[model samples]
Target: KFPRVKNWELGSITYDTLCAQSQQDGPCTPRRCLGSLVLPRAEQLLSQARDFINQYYSSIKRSGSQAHEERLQEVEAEVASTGTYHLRESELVFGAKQAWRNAPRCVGRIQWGKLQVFDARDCSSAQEMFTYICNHIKYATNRGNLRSAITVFPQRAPGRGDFRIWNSQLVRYAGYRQQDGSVRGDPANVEITELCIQHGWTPGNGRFDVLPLLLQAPDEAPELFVLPPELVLEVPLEHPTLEWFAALGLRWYALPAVSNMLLEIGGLEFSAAPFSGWYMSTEIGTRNLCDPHRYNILEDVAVCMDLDTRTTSSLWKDKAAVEINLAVLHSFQLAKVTIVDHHAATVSFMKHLDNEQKARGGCPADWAWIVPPISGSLTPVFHQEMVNYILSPAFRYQPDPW
Candidate 1:
């Protein structure tokens, strides 16, 4: 008897008695098994290969963040293999957001404050968003704190991804209210959270009113505040370039130098227009607070608010945001605040043109600030200037290109 043999890799469909008809009727088809074909050493070699990749990946991360904690480095290493790499810029954005969201966690009940944290990402209706935040403040107040901290988290990053929010400190919280209602920091005393179309939404522009109230006692009352450019100064800034104005005889107040403060309010040119989208500035200040080597002391304080014209509310909108900026400059010797958005026309128009005679020309000769031995005074004011100057057009600049 002759025996017929069929191999699985030779197109044999069945393990039955060899027959062409039987093979045609069977479901099993000849196939190759890669697992079975590999040599025994392949598995061991592959495992060693994986370990090598992991070791180098970890090395790369540790190389960047020298100060990375042991645990953090461990987690970071896990993600490294998954394609996401370490980026300094991304870390900044993410870090800042983390700090802001936790600002209250650090301060233990400052003046019995209320916290209204909003998700800027999911706020479909600005009205609803306003109402929800206002209500939270009101609730916190009724609970009996005189002030509330309403922090708004922006959902969208103009160019960056979700790995980072704002520079974390991009925006800050503050608040204001119409005289019609009063608010307290404790939820036991909450009032005035409702969105009253008649009264206005959330009650103040950029929470300018909100912050001063919460930071101080109810009796202290917020007067006015200013956001200064801290990084660098714009050469020919959007409105009045210091050089152009300097050409008119103004000089940087080197002594009692501008404190180099970073001011955050809101979009002046953009938000003033209803159809226009919101924008924020990260530019630094070029101008100094006092006249260079001389002092042009702040003589008085000027307070201004951007009241929206479209909504007929006191909330800052459009040109009013710009007006607030001007108001601060009007008080400071170095800059002038001018209203560009239509919404702020009324306030801008009312500002008593401080006698142009008071314009800063020269500094008082006898002014000086205390200096630490290693202070960076001689350098060309790098931080402030570079703020206005981006490496490339997009706000994307990473320290390590490799």
Candidate 2:
């Protein structure tokens, strides 16, 4: 029997026939469910390659055609000899979009078809990779009007280590562990910051010091490349109503390029294909700024608002949090940056789910992730029951390059 997914608020239901396609199971069974667990490849090269090639051909309405048959044979020949095969640029583009579409955690999959795919598979050295990364940022930032894009570096090799990006993101602030066991900057980035320092990067004593990229080529030591100041665009937080909020000096980089994810297309694994999209306001406002382990700015903002922090029932945290979220939305808008408020994003995602329900039976989504962090029950996605599953070509997390 198919899982009957329902929207509590909309009174609409979609039976998830697509959940049967899930190859990897979450922490769930017939007895218990671990739905709140925040933490959670390549088979026979020729068959997977053929399957993906078939998918690509099907996408263009060319299934079983001469070109489709020829392409499949070409993949077979390459993989038969080398144990690996490469994707054509057009094939890679299709795979990248499909990967984004298949990402269960992403709320912005509505823009999957709009990604600008950059083929950097020819990148040979770490220095070369840095050049490609810089160009990608320039195009993606687009002078504050962001565009979704991914740069695919060389795929993983059979006899060599994969190309890797040590930094979790293309642009992120440094976190320095102080003498008294206190973190001065973003506590989440301390390990990466220490790695940067050990690799000869001069650590800056500020909360928003942009860390350098640790780019690694196959079987080579990672090289440090500091991003040019002009390339990384930042939006400084300012409240529409509270003028003193800017005094906190909080700011965030524009691009959300995830550099450490492994992009698997067919059987080829591109270990350093960094992809980015515009941010959702809740990501920056609720999680990045207010998470206790990250910036931890809730209490600071509460004190600024003259809230009764001593009592949870007073709802001071709630008020302060809403104001910060507003500040983020206002600041990004004032800067002419492309960012979506959680409300708009979730509504758009609901449309996407509806679209997918018709096009692909049902959408694969993680309910815990699709819902907004701050106003969980208030958003449309929060009330929707979703089926978590895997589809490929896909983007996946890999271990630290070290």
Candidate 3:
């Protein structure tokens, strides 16, 4: 070995090798993982509580550090004995606000601090969920000027199934697909409409027909309840200058109360939590009316506006879209309903980002949602790089009860 000790041979020689390893594959693996990342339910609850305590409690200058550790210990002890723990009133309230603030899809986070949270955690029946929803609608609608609110029912517990509100919203139009595959109303609600029909509820054939609520209590059969017409406030659509737009017979509800979203606070899930905010004009004009999957009314609207419909260069689609948006804004303004235009709403969101940056370090946002479907590039949010993250005390979409 010493015979090759020349200058060239003196250089270090290293052999390369790789470590072969295999990972377990199953539901718990990275590919198919589901539910909490934490192994046990108790650990998930404890982790969520700790995050909530640090975020919500620390902001108010109240030291919850001791309480956070104590809560974790309590959760451990309770899970060992009874397999569950309870959320305090203050915790629930703070959690609700944080959820609103953390909602990536909502642009109205400026009002997050002012949301009214109604705790219906002890609700035992579907009828009670219905009543709570009706009350929330009345309160949030406030006639015309909308107020943000959320009605949270009981969380999912072991052995007992979660309570659920089956409606997409407290107020939504029914969609009935015809024999020709053409939808008669909101295409989004077609499945729910069919379910309603099966439940012995008759849906009227109209564009703006209000759908009934299908409520289901824990481990119980779903039931349909007709929503009172008086409780729902709708604005009749009309053009600011164009007189022919109203002939389309278009209308939308004042408050957009999203009912199917689950409210999660400290690993506890409220399956029937219903929260509301005032509508953005584009949500009605661009999406609900113009989306091909929904109404697909662009051509009809272009024809109404007398635009050249033969070619893409004619900008007939853009022209019609603008007019439709104008009508929605004009109508909502005429009705004194709480609605924000895309421009104003985006500006507000910019401000919200700035505020959150100073207050909470950064804001979570979905760039696609924050940007309007039309003229997205023109808005500041479209250009701004956004950071999205899931924060505890958040609202999430859940599957239909049916």
Candidate 4:
């Protein structure tokens, strides 16, 4: 028996048999279901590797084949001999795709199948990691036609230091702590900016100063590498209907390359694998620019639009939010960048949820995260209840390599 899943908008229903595989418990009980909050591991290496290899073979429809059996035995023998084993190049690609597919918080799983897997496992030094990262940036940037891609560095090995990327994302605005103790740039990155300066790299003074990369190899200090300015594609925000909107001097990078997440396949962990996917408009629009902790530009945009700022009853926040999201969609379209608006993105995710129901019995999703930042109530996903559970080959957050 499984939990019944339903979509209020569609009046559809399904049971989540897939969730039964979640051996771990979430923060829920019979008395309460606190699902809005956002936020595992063991050896059994031989077991995990076999299951993963089986998954890969199943993907290829070769599950009962002799090759699959040989691969499993090879994995077991190697793990027994060396205490760990490596994924084949083909298996690595499959695992990466599965990781994105299994990510409960991402709404863009629709593009999970098309990710470009870059195996940089042979990388041995921080300097080499910089080259690989720069290359990843160049390839994924593609002059604003951003591509979905990931570069997997060396995996975590027994008793060895992990290769790491210090920045949260490959490209992030520097957040300088002001003389008055306020943040001058994207405040989310203040700590990383401080760490960059502490590591002897020069800092820039600007609201959108692009930060440098701090790449770390096993047992070595992180090396600082400044990305060539030409490689970073950025769009200056402008409004379609407002004349004064361009004067704000607001801009954002085209690539959303997340650099700090751990990529887990089977029992193995790739600590330095960075992945990039194109942004959904609301992510940059409603959240990044308008969130209280980030840029907090709601009041600024409201003032520009001459909306009623003195009262919440005016729906001023809602008006300001739509215009901002409009600017985000407009600017990216004007710049020929790959960005999907919230309505379109959410619509596709709804389709994806349906597809998964027929294919995988259930889709693991966080209802809070699946819904967009603004206008969520108007979206079909908002009317849907989701089942969130841990699934693997997954992308997971790890401790910052401070």
Top lDDT hit: 2
Cα lDDT of model 2 by residue, 124-234, tens digit = 899999999999999999999999999999999888999999999999999999999999888999999999889899998999999999998888888999999999999
lDDT-wise, the better of 1 and 3 is 3
Query: Which residues of candidate 3, in runs, are more than 4 Å off?
Result: 1-41, 64-76
Worst 10 residues of 4 by lDDT: 34-43
* lDDT of candidate 3 over 323-392, digit per residue (tens): 8999999999999989999999988897887777666556766676788989888776776766444556
Report model 4's TM-score to 2 decimal places.
Answer: 0.97
* Per-residue lDDT value at 44 in model 3: 63
- lDDT over C-alpha atoms for residue 34 of model 1: 31
Considering only N, C-alpha and C atoms within 3 Å, which residue pairs clash in candidate 4?
A: none
Model 2 per-residue lDDT at 272: 92
TM-score for every candidate vs. truth? 0.19, 0.97, 0.87, 0.97
Give me the overall lDDT of model 2: 0.91
Off by over 4 Å in 4: 31-34, 40-43
lDDT, candidate 4, 48-159, per-residue tens: 7878898899999999899998998889888988999999999999999999998999999988889999999999898899989989989998888888999999999888
* Cα error, candidate 1, residue 376 (Å): 26
